[PDB]
Design an enzyme around this catalytic site. Structure first.
Site, PDB file in Angstrom:
ATOM      1  N   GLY A 287     103.041 -36.854  35.457  1.00 34.57           N
ATOM      2  CA  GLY A 287     101.910 -37.730  35.721  1.00 34.57           C
ATOM      3  C   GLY A 287     101.404 -38.594  34.553  1.00 34.57           C
ATOM      4  N   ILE A 288     102.275 -38.931  33.588  1.00 33.96           N
ATOM      5  CA  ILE A 288     101.880 -39.740  32.447  1.00 33.96           C
ATOM      6  C   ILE A 288     102.794 -40.942  32.165  1.00 33.96           C
ATOM      7  CG2 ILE A 288     100.658 -37.713  31.429  1.00 33.96           C
ATOM      8  CD1 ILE A 288     103.067 -37.180  29.573  1.00 33.96           C
TER       9      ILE A 288
ATOM     10  N   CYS B  70     103.777 -38.899  39.411  1.00 34.47           N
ATOM     11  CA  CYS B  70     105.197 -38.831  39.218  1.00 34.47           C
ATOM     12  C   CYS B  70     105.554 -37.319  39.132  1.00 34.47           C
ATOM     13  CB  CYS B  70     105.753 -39.718  38.076  1.00 34.47           C
ATOM     14  SG  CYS B  70     104.924 -39.597  36.483  1.00 34.47           S
TER      15      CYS B  70
END
Ligand SMILES: c1ccc(-c2c[nH]c3cccnc23)cc1
Length: 502
Positions: free
Chosen positions: A436-437, A433
């Site tokens: 990234g989490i 994204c």
């Protein structure tokens, strides 16, 4: 370890706690009572209390006049080990020195509130094992508590359930003698370390809380019905466990790697980071990307950030090295006028070189919720290294919160799954994204859960928070918000229904 979070306190209760039980540098954190994703850091400095807003829309915790973080525990660890770094609007420094501990037991996995000895006995008998335990309200003696512990051989009388009464006197807790504790958590931690030994020698070992989150997938509708009237409470119990996941991130903290991170404090764990080999000899550190391997514990994932202009070449080195054949992108390149991911792929029919890698965009196909780009990746100077990489670019995720219906995501993930399954010896599926989490974690956890039901059908055990905790041990803060948490349950429910419909 996370006692500075107070789940059920108001602003004025937080002020009075800091003013009467704290000193300058005392702090706590708390939810907003009506606003999911809003939290407050309340801090004492020069005999006054300051409240600092933390927002989370799904991507990261954004502290006002501070940084962005993957978890509140990582936020507190950063500033407790870094003074002068948190400043007011006026520039003056707000020091976080002394956590102000919460006594409330409700986000402990072991705490079951109202419950009978007979109910706790059947739960410990059916679900429990040696050292399985719970704490509950007494009912005979109002205001007291009971600790119930299963101990035995793993219904033949080789195992049993004991009940230890816990008195509450002056809002301290005891089991009838010895130490009086400021909270049930302090009592549990003590008798976890220093188990009660019965007169005839049975050691009442508190090995694990009783599991209340594991469900049969067929019965998902009943669990969601029950959580919908809760989801917040189950999420906050999971969040309480994040203090166990402060694993080292030293490689991402290196000076040499600073400009390779989208957010300076959102970093990959050393123990699961992707290490890049065969780097440029002239670049002294070329082994680093902000990315982790996520293993379900056949399909594995890489969870990564959106590319920066200076990490696009490293991204393609990763894809190539790991033999990945599918990429899932869960952001537009730009949202709210902010770049979330640089374009790291060529325009349709075009060919570009990214360092030692070359990528051709063969064909794009637009679906409602996503675009598929069929990419061909090869190393420059080596023709026989070409492989197809299918980039699934999800385009309709809302700028804040989650989709109102999970059908688009599930249809997307089914197509991703079939693509991956059709490719012999494909590597991990890359998912990214912005940080990234948040979205990345939500898509991965949905994928892992749906895959269980794909192997084992509608009659199998799933455990949503246990799955999230396991993925969270491999990259920081995977699944960011309670809205993502509920969306995960809704997606699994919709998956199960469409299979029962068939
Ligand atoms: C692993 C397994 C379960 C959990 C958990 C999340 N919410 C809960 C509410 C009650 C009991 N357990 C939980 C967290 C990590």
């Amino acid at each position: 370890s996370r006692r500075w979070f107070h789940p059920n306190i108001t602003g004025v209760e937080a002020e009075n706690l800091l003013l009467t039980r704290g000193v300058d540098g005392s702090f706590l954190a708390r939810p907003s009572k009506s606003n999911p994703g809003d939290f407050t850091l309340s801090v004492r400095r020069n005999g006054a209390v300051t409240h600092i807003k933390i927002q989370n829309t799904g991507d990261y915790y954004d502290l006002y006049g501070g940084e962005k973080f993957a978890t509140l525990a990582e936020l507190v660890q950063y500033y407790m080990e870094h003074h002068g770094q948190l400043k007011e609007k006026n520039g003056d420094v707000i020091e976080l020195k002394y956590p102000l501990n919460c006594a409330d037991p409700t986000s402990e996995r072991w705490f079951h509130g109202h419950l009978s000895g007979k109910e706790a006995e059947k739960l410990l008998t059916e679900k429990g094992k040696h050292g399985s335990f719970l704490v509950r309200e007494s009912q005979s003696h109002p205001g007291d508590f009971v600790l119930s512990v299963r101990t035995g051989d793993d219904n033949d009388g080789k195992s049993k359930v004991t009940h230890v009464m816990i008195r509450c006197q002056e809002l301290k807790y005891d089991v009838g003698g010895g130490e009086r504790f400021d909270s049930l958590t302090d009592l549990v931690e003590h008798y976890k370390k220093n188990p009660m030994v019965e007169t005839l020698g049975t050691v009442l070992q508190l090995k694990q809380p009783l599991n209340t989150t594991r469900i049969n997938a067929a019965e998902i509708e009943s669990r969601v019905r029950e959580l919908s009237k809760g989801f917040w409470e189950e999420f906050e119990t999971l969040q309480q466990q994040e203090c166990k996941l402060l694993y080292s991130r030293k490689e991402g903290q290196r000076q040499e790697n600073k400009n390779k991170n989208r957010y300076k404090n959102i970093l990959p764990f050393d123990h699961t980071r992707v290490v890049l080999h065969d780097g440029d000899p002239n670049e002294p550190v070329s082994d680093y990307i902000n990315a982790n391997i996520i293993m379900p514990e056949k399909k594995s994932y890489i969870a990564t950030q959106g590319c920066l202009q200076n990490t696009v070449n490293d991204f393609w080195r990763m894809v190539f090295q790991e033999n990945s054949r599918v990429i899932v992108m869960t952001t537009k390149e730009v949202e709210r006028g902010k770049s979330k991911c640089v374009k790291y792929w060529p325009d349709e029919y075009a060919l570009k070189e990214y360092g030692v890698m070359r990528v051709r965009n063969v064909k794009e196909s637009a679906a409602h919720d996503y675009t598929l780009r069929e990419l061909k990746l090869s190393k420059v100077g080596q023709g026989n290294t070409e492989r197809t990489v299918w980039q699934y670019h999800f385009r309709t995720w809302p700028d804040h919160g989650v989709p109102s219906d999970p059908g688009g995501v599930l249809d997307f993930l089914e197509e991703v799954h079939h693509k991956q399954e059709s490719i012999m010896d494909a590597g991990p599926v890359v998912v990214h994204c912005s940080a990234g989490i948040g979205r990345t974690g939500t898509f991965i956890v949905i994928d892992i859960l749906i895959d269980i039901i794909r192997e084992k059908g509608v009659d199998c055990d799933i455990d949503v928070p246990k799955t999230i905790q396991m993925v969270r041990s491999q990259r920081s803060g995977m699944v960011q918000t309670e809205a993502q948490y509920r969306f995960i349950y809704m997606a699994v429910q919709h998956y199960i229904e469409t299979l029962q419909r068939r």
